[PDB]
RNA sequence: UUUGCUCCACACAAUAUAGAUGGAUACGAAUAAGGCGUCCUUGUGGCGUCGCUGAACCAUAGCAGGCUAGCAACGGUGCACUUGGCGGAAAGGCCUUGGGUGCUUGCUGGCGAAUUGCAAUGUCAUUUUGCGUGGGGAUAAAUCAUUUGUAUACGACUUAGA
RNA sequence: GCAGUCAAGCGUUCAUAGCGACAUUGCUUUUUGAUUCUUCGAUGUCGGCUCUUCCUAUCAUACCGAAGCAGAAUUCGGUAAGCGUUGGAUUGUUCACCCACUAAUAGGGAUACCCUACUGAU
RNA sequence: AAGCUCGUAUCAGUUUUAUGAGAAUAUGUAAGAAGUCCGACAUUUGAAUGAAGAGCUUUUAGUGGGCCAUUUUUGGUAAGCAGAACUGGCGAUGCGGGAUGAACCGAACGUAGAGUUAAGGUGCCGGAAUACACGCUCAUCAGACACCACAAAAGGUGUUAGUUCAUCUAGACAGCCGGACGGUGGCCAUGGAAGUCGGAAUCCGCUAAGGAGUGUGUAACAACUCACCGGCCGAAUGAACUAGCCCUGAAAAUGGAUGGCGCUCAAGCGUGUUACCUAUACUCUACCGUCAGGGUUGAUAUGAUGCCCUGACGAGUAGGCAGG
RNA sequence: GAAAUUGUUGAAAGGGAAGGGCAUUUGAUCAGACAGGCCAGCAUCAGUUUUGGUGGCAGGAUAAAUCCAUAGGAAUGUAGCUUGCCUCGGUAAGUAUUAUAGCCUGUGGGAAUACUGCCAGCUGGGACUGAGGACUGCGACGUAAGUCAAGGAUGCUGGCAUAAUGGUUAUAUGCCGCCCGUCU
């Protein structure tokens, strides 16, 4: 006895199971023979509408995501076992979160398109602060007239985990002293990432990178090491 | 085997010491007990305090001056839970307990004398580790023995004087041991070495 | 079920020293010294070399094992007190009645005095313990700073005052005033 | 008691127009021959509708185990009728012989479920020659290699009552 | 109210043991830790070593322990003296100087043992008291009666009186 | 109370041979506080004091938690028995039920000189 | 008790064979000369086992108050309750144990010695082990004996042994971060209701996954989290159910009890092995006493109800008999 | 000139009980016989009974086992080899089936031992008992006369010859004991 009671819900959602795992393991190998190229794209932090955008952009190409070892199940890690030849070498290099792209139009347009494709996302970059006065949705990035105050419910959280001094008068939120939120040229603390989320500041550049490619009729590994 | 036996009541257990003490009494080995405030009992402090309070509330309904005496001090607790083990109402009982002499600390003359123990009652042996116990000095202090800070002091004095004794005795036994070592490898010693000495 | 043995490890940096006789532990390092008694919990230690040390239990039950992780949590806090030292921080707040706050050293006791809680005349002393220092806050209004090496000591002292300034007979849904902690972090 | 293993083979009856009913054996655990025979009839009645008068022993054989020296991690299936209704079990043992293993097991059931010997059917006892088929942990933890452990705090036992030493463990 | 009362030794008497018949042989503190010898940087230090029961240690031979002889060593030990210490928790004992006084089984000799008749606890110690011993030491209260009354059932408690 | 529903489980095995956990629905003397003065065979001997102690399941006095607690006081609950719980009005009757105070005016149980116990005394 | 007859005698609170009545249990009868044939058939003459005897006539004393336990059977909540029937214990009956007892376990008695056991027990009171061995349990009233103060249902983030389902180095669970999209602010509802004041419904695209959306909350919106997925770390882990110990269920009031002391790797609960303790019970032995079977007037001598040999047995109120 | 009851003396005991029962101690008290009475011990034998060590035997799977030879296998993987670092061996894997350790299973071989049970096999220690009273018989030793553990114990020796053992009796001590008779 004396257990940690696992908390239960009554959500209408259901768990994934293994049927999805076998499904994607089948569909990867389904894409393999039919398509010519197999591109590897290293990407760790991705957004849902952005993935919707790039999904609807390239219907000629097929982008798929899944667990690393399930992709290794589909393609086959060793040269001794694999769907087809000269893929085991690409099986080794894929270390992090990767999305697999299958193209049949051109090798150069693929690598150059995403080096052309750059966006603005969160750091997870320049520095920022707040003034020692009333605080706003941006927190002084914009004029205070059009800037609306933050809602008072989340002010305790700012006190708690962002550690910022604060005290709530009538509905305008206020402080006594300013605080530089972060500095330039260093990967951010979690408090810093979360406060730029709360402000809504995607100050970080974003490029999806490519590390290699394949081509069937050549049956060779294309090593394209770019960020 | 001896005329007299002198028990240290340290790290010991009340029931299991009372038992052997009783039998050695009624077979006739005069016994003295000391350091009974260093004694110990199984079970935690709160258990033993409630066992004591349930006794504490029991007196004669009409006149307490004749009814049960709720003795406080530890030697008298041990004596209580020993006279329960012997027939004090008889004369064999009273002539047992004219052989028992129970004290706190170690008063004289016994401090100069050989303290012993009883292995089949010790805490460390006859209990499992990872388990509680209660110090009787603390319990008596918690139910109105008003003396605990004093036996502490006199125990300190005896401890220091005995350590100063122990230095002398250690030095002297070092001397005689060195002498007997130099007495070794001599045929008068080698014969004894053959015969087990 | 008598897991035949179980172990945790305490990993330690170079410059700090530790020392343990039977269960009597000491920690000496950059910030200074700490010490604690562990004679009540019946566990065993063994060193491998000079950064790392293995607590261990032999032939133990569930309670006898659940001591162990708690000991690990104790000893890391002990060590980090000597490496970093710990820092707490409070704010002494009010709606209408400004609290007076004061350190006083009477008999070297280093008491903490407070007054003017909703206009009440009573003085309320909170003493200060060994090896813990107090600092009234610089450049932060209505703020107080704690510093020490012993987490248990500083936290107990922080708890004492916020119990001693406790409101009674009244509704905290309307009344607000009370001293609480901003956060609990290291010195460094 | 100090248990033993026993082969018992029984034969329903010599009868005319059914000579030599086929045969019926059991592997049986007991201290002596008689309790084996009685348990044999007790279980044999359960299997089908025969009796001691409609039963007879062919013969028995005491069974000395083949490898006393060999440690053998056994695993055993048991059914028993508790205070409440019946239920089944699988257990796992590291002991030497079947006889010492079950002698420990009956004590263990006697402790943990107040199992008296009458209401406890040995379904089967077996050996587990390889690893990777043990499920439990209170056997598994004795099997790693280079295994060592201490015996702290040996409770010595003196015959004498007094002693003059204020003793030490080790 | 006859010379009673005490303490030094001692001869005899009694009166009995909750039960002697080599030794009540001293550290403390922990026990999932420690003792002892030793080393130096004095440490919660190192090196070595020990435990598993004191089935030990110390003592121990003489007629229930004699008379004597030496040999060798400066010791051990009893007895009464003597010196200076220590200890109040229920010390009432534990040290130490000085010599005197013996015995020495540390080694080697001589003499005697009988007859309690094959054993019969085969009496050895210690409590108390007394009467006698010859040697020092000191030579009072209380109660009653009486009176007061801070008290008072009667007793008692408190006072006073050469 | 009775009668269903829901039905964790039980039953050589089981819905349906049958029980059954907890909730729910059925009015049971009146949907707009209008009231109704309903005491309808109280069939037993205690009743009422002097006065001691004990139990708590506390009525206030302690300390506490939560409650729309802005306060005062109140509503509940918890540890709590250390200390306290009244003066009158009315019947042979305990049945019945008011006035006012106080912080409250909680509920319960338990001839005699003779030997014993108790209070005191040599 | 007095006679008469038998004497190995009819028998049995009994089984077995056989067969009935009404499946077992229980219950009835047969198991031979007193039978078989028209003078013929003796102890292998008709199963087992045991027999200080069996039957017939006459007569005499005391007795004819019930309780409790098991079983069949009727009622109910059931009693120190009632309706029926068989058997047993009591009463008349001691003794060891149950701490003590009108009902439980054991066991029925001369006086004594030795021995050995029963039921119950071996921390001390108390004779006997702080024996050995496997486990469990830590109670702010632990528990310590069957029927001689019991409660379940259930509750329990205390502990143990399990069963069955599940996941898992093709990466199990914990923990950190991100993702957690549209028509959509879905429909009327409203003054305002946009994933959640609220009723109906409740779907599809992309999807690794994302519900017309569990909670946080604005007058509305907004913002945050898990449930749903992926990452970084790497081995096991989760759910339901069961049953033993434990806590709760499970309370009164003079001060109060496992019998007291007290006990917690027990002196407790569950199991086993040996050893040990002692009762008027068992064995052996001396003596007494009765009873029964045997021998014994014979010279010399003293008792014929006497003497001798052997064996078994001994409780006992009312009542009876004999000697004193 | 009894008893209740009462006093004095002598002895003894005594903390909320007394009296009684079994055994004994202490104290008081006491009868009997030595001219063969009392208490004890040693040896041998008999009966009952207890407790040790040792010896010989039969069994089961003619024990299983161990041990020896033998084929095969695997690991909680031994040597060896290989790899990553790296204090230069030390981890982690992978190999490797005796190699620079060994184990398991299966077969075969010849013994012992335990466990159980049997001895009209030996031998020792300790306690209680001593019944009965010319011989008779079943018996053993033997050639034998005769001997003997053979239908119930004798021999040798010691001391005392007295309140020493014992008896009575008050008392203490361990343990036990519910107040008598009668109706119910």
Curated annotation (Swiss-Prot), chain A:
Q: Which key words tag this protein in UniProt? A: Cytoplasm, Nucleus, Ribosome biogenesis
Which top-rank group of organisms is this from? Eukaryota
Q: Where in the cell is it found?
A: Nucleus, Nucleolus; Cytoplasm
Biological process terms in GO annotation: maturation of SSU-rRNA; nuclear-transcribed mRNA catabolic process; ribosomal large subunit assembly; ribosomal large subunit biogenesis; ribosomal large subunit export from nucleus; rRNA processing
User: Which Pfam families would you find in this protein's record?
Assistant: Ribosomal_L10, RL10P_insert
Where it mainly occurs, coarsely classed, is nucleus
Q: Which GO terms describe its molecular function?
A: large ribosomal subunit rRNA binding
Q: Pull one GO CC term from this UniProt entry.
A: cytoplasm
**Subunit composition?**
Associates with the pre-60S ribosomal particle.
Other remarks on this protein: Present with 18200 molecules/cell in log phase SD medium.
The entry sums up its family as follows:
Belongs to the universal ribosomal protein uL10 family.
What's this protein's function?
Component of the ribosome assembly machinery. Nuclear paralog of the ribosomal protein P0, it binds pre-60S subunits at an early stage of assembly in the nucleolus, and is replaced by P0 in cytoplasmic pre-60S subunits and mature 80S ribosomes.
Q: What name does the UniProt record give this protein?
A: Ribosome assembly factor MRT4
Q: Which gene encodes it?
A: MRT4
Swiss-Prot record, chain B:
Write out the PTM section of this UniProt entry: N-terminally acetylated by acetyltransferase NatA.
Annotated GO biological processes are: cytoplasmic translation; maturation of LSU-rRNA; negative regulation of translation
Bilayer-crossing residues are: none
Note the position of the cross-link Glycyl lysine isopeptide (Lys-Gly) (interchain with G-Cter in ubiquitin): 175
* Coiled-coil ranges (or none): none
Please tell me one Gene Ontology term that the record gives under cellular component. cytosolic large ribosomal subunit
- Domain of life, per lineage: Eukaryota
Q: Which CDD domains match?
A: Ribosomal_L13
User: According to its UniProt record, where is this protein located?
Assistant: Cytoplasm
Question: What GO terms are given for molecular function?
Answer: mRNA binding; RNA binding; structural constituent of ribosome
Q: Which InterPro entries match?
A: Ribosomal_uL13, Ribosomal_uL13_CS, Ribosomal_uL13_euk/arc, Ribosomal_uL13_sf
- Which keywords belong to this entry? Acetylation, Cytoplasm, Isopeptide bond, Ribonucleoprotein, Ribosomal protein, Ubl conjugation
Similarity section: Belongs to the universal ribosomal protein uL13 family.
NCBIfam families, per database record: L13_A_E (TIGR01077)
**Miscellaneous comment:** Present with 43300 molecules/cell in log phase SD medium.
Q: What is the annotated role of this protein in its UniProt record?
A: Component of the ribosome, a large ribonucleoprotein complex responsible for the synthesis of proteins in the cell. The small ribosomal subunit (SSU) binds messenger RNAs (mRNAs) and translates the encoded message by selecting cognate aminoacyl-transfer RNA (tRNA) molecules. The large subunit (LSU) contains the ribosomal catalytic site termed the peptidyl transferase center (PTC), which catalyzes the formation of peptide bonds, thereby polymerizing the amino acids delivered by tRNAs into a polypeptide chain.
By what name is this protein known?
A: Large ribosomal subunit protein uL13A
UniProtKB/Swiss-Prot annotation, chain C:
GO MF annotations in UniProt? rRNA binding; structural constituent of ribosome
Keywords from UniProt, A to Z, are: Cytoplasm, Ribonucleoprotein, Ribosomal protein
* Subcellular location(s) of the protein: Cytoplasm
One Pfam family matching this protein: Ribosomal_L6
Q: Which residues cross the membrane?
A: none
An annotated GO cellular component of this protein is: cytosol
Q: Which GO terms describe its biological process?
A: cytoplasmic translation
> Is Ion transport one of the keywords?
no
Question: How does the record describe its quaternary structure?
Answer: Component of the large ribosomal subunit (LSU). Mature yeast ribosomes consist of a small (40S) and a large (60S) subunit. The 40S small subunit contains 1 molecule of ribosomal RNA (18S rRNA) and 33 different proteins (encoded by 57 genes). The large 60S subunit contains 3 rRNA molecules (25S, 5.8S and 5S rRNA) and 46 different proteins (encoded by 81 genes). uL6 lines the binding pocket for eukaryotic elongation factor 2 (eEF2).
Q: What else is known?
A: Present with 52400 molecules/cell in log phase SD medium.
What the protein does comes down to: Component of the ribosome, a large ribonucleoprotein complex responsible for the synthesis of proteins in the cell. The small ribosomal subunit (SSU) binds messenger RNAs (mRNAs) and translates the encoded message by selecting cognate aminoacyl-transfer RNA (tRNA) molecules. The large subunit (LSU) contains the ribosomal catalytic site termed the peptidyl transferase center (PTC), which catalyzes the formation of peptide bonds, thereby polymerizing the amino acids delivered by tRNAs into a polypeptide chain.
UniProt similarity note = Belongs to the universal ribosomal protein uL6 family.
What is the name listed in the Swiss-Prot or TrEMBL entry for this protein?
Answer: Large ribosomal subunit protein uL6A
From Swiss-Prot, chain D:
User: Gene3D superfamilies, per this entry?
Assistant: 3.10.20.10
Q: Where does the record say this protein resides?
A: Cytoplasm
Its GO CC terms? Answer: cytosol; cytosolic large ribosomal subunit
Among its keywords, does the record have Cytoplasm?
yes
Instruction: Please give the biological process terms from Gene Ontology that the record holds.
Output: cytoplasmic translation
Cross-linked residues, Glycyl lysine isopeptide (Lys-Gly) (interchain with G-Cter in ubiquitin): 124, 130, 148
On the tree of life, the source organism's domain of life is Eukaryota
InterPro entries recorded for this chain?
Ribosomal_eL20, Ribosomal_eL20_dom, Ribosomal_eL20_eukaryotes
* GO molecular function (one): structural constituent of ribosome
Using the record's annotations, give every residue carrying the modification Phosphoserine.
31
Q: Does the keyword Ribonucleoprotein apply?
A: yes
The alphabetized UniProt keywords are:
Cytoplasm, Isopeptide bond, Phosphoprotein, Ribonucleoprotein, Ribosomal protein, Ubl conjugation
Pfam families cross-referenced by the UniProt entry: Ribosomal_L18A (PF01775)
Describe its partners and assembly state.
Component of the large ribosomal subunit (LSU). Mature yeast ribosomes consist of a small (40S) and a large (60S) subunit. The 40S small subunit contains 1 molecule of ribosomal RNA (18S rRNA) and 33 different proteins (encoded by 57 genes). The large 60S subunit contains 3 rRNA molecules (25S, 5.8S and 5S rRNA) and 46 different proteins (encoded by 81 genes). eL20 forms multiple interactions with RNA and proteins in the central protuberance, connecting components of core functional centers that are located far apart.
- Print the miscellaneous field: Present with 54300 molecules/cell in log phase SD medium. There are 2 genes for eL20 in yeast.
Per the similarity annotation, which family is this? Answer: Belongs to the eukaryotic ribosomal protein eL20 family.
The protein in question is named: Large ribosomal subunit protein eL20A
The gene name reads RPL20A
């Amino acid at each position: 006895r004396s257990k940690r009671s696992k908390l239960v819900t009554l959500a209408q959602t259901d768990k994934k199971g293994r049927e999805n795992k076998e499904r994607i393991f089948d569909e990867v190998r389904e894409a393999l023979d039919t398509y010519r190229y197999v591109w590897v794209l290293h990407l760790d932090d991705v957004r849902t509408p952005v993935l919707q955008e790039i999904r609807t952009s390239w219907a000629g190409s097929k982008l798929i995501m899944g667990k690393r070892k399930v992709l290794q199940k589909a393609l086959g890690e060793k040269r001794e076992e694999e769907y087809k030849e000269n893929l085991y070498q690409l099986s080794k290099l894929c270390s992090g979160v990767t999305g697999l792209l299958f193209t049949d139009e051109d090798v150069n347009t693929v690598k150059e398109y995403f080096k052309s494709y750059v966006r603005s996302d969160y750091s997870r970059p320049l520095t920022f602060t707040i003034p020692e006065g009333i605080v706003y949705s941006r927190g002084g990035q914009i004029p205070a007239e059009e800037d609306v105050p933050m809602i008072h419910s989340l002010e305790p959280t700012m006190r708690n985990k962002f550690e910022i001094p604060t005290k709530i008068k009538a509905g305008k939120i206020t402080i006594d002293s300013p605080y530089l939120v972060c500095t330039e040229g260093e990967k951010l603390d979690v408090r810093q990432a979360l406060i730029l989320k709360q402000f809504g500041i995607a100050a970080s550049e974003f490029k999806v990178k490519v590390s290699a490619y394949y081509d069937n009729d050549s049956s060779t590994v294309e090593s394209t090491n770019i960020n | 085997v001896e005329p007299v036996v002198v028990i240290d009541g340290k790290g010991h257990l009340v029931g299991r010491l009372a038992s052997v003490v009783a039998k050695q009494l009624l077979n006739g080995q005069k016994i003295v007990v000391v350091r009974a405030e260093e004694l110990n009992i199984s079970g935690e402090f709160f258990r033993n305090k409630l066992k004591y309070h349930d006794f504490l509330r029991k007196a004669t309904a009409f006149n307490k001056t004749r009814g049960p005496f709720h003795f406080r001090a530890p030697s008298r607790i041990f004596y209580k839970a020993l006279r329960g083990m012997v027939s004090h109402k008889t004369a064999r009982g009273k002539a047992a307990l004219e052989r028992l002499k129970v004290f706190e600390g170690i008063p004289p003359p016994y401090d100069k004398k050989k303290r012993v123990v009883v292995p089949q009652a010790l805490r460390v042996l006859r209990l499992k580790p990872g388990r509680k116990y209660t110090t009787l000095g603390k319990l008596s202090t918690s139910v109105g023995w008003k003396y605990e800070d004093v036996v502490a002091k006199l125990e300190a004095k005896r401890k220091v004087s005995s350590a100063e004794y122990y230095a002398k005795k250690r030095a002297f036994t070092k001397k005689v041991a060195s002498a007997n070592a130099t007495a070794a490898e001599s045929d008068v010693a080698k014969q004894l070495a053959a015969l087990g000495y | 079920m008598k897991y035949i043995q179980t172990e945790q490890q305490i990993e330690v940096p170079e410059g700090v020293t530790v020392s343990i006789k039977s269960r009597i532990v000491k920690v000496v390092g950059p910030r200074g010294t700490l010490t604690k008694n562990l004679k009540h919990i019946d566990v065993t230690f063994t060193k491998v070399n000079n950064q790392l040390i293995k607590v261990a239990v032999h032939n133990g039950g569930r309670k006898h094992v659940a001591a162990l992780r708690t000991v690990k949590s104790l000893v890391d806090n002990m060590i980090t007190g000597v490496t970093k030292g710990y820092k707490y921080k409070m704010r002494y707040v009010y709606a209408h009645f400004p609290i007076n706050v004061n350190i006083v050293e009477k008999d070297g006791a280093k008491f903490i005095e407070v007054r003017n809680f909703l206009g009440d005349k009573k003085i309320r002393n909170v003493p200060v313990r060994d090896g813990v220092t107090i600092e009234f806050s610089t450049n932060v209004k209505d703020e107080i700073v704690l510093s020490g090496n012993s987490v248990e000591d500083v936290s107990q002292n922080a708890a004492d005052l916020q119990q001693i300034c406790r409101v009674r007979n009244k509704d905290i849904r309307k009344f607000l005033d009370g001293i609480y902690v901003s956060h609990k972090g290291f010195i460094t | 008691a100090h248990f033993k293993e026993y082969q018992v083979i029984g034969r329903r009856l010599p009868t005319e127009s059914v000579p030599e009913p086929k045969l019926f054996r059991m592997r049986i655990f007991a201290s002596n021959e008689v309790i084996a025979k009685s348990r044999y009839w007790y279980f044999l009645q359960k299997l089908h509708k025969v009796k001691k008068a409609s039963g007879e022993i062919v013969s028995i054989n005491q069974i000395n185990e083949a490898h006393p020296t060999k440690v053998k991690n056994f695993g055993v299936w048991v059914r028993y009728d508790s205070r409440s209704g019946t239920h089944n079990m699988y257990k796992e043992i590291r002991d030497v012989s079947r006889v010492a293993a079950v002698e420990t097991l009956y004590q263990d059931m006697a402790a943990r479920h107040r199992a008296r010997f009458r209401s406890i059917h040995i379904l089967k006892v077996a050996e587990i020659e390889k690893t990777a088929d043990v499920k439990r942990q209170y056997v598994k933890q004795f099997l790693t290699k280079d295994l060592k452990f201490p015996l702290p705090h040996r409770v010595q036992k003196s015959t004498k009552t007094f002693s003059y030493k204020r003793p030490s463990t080790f």
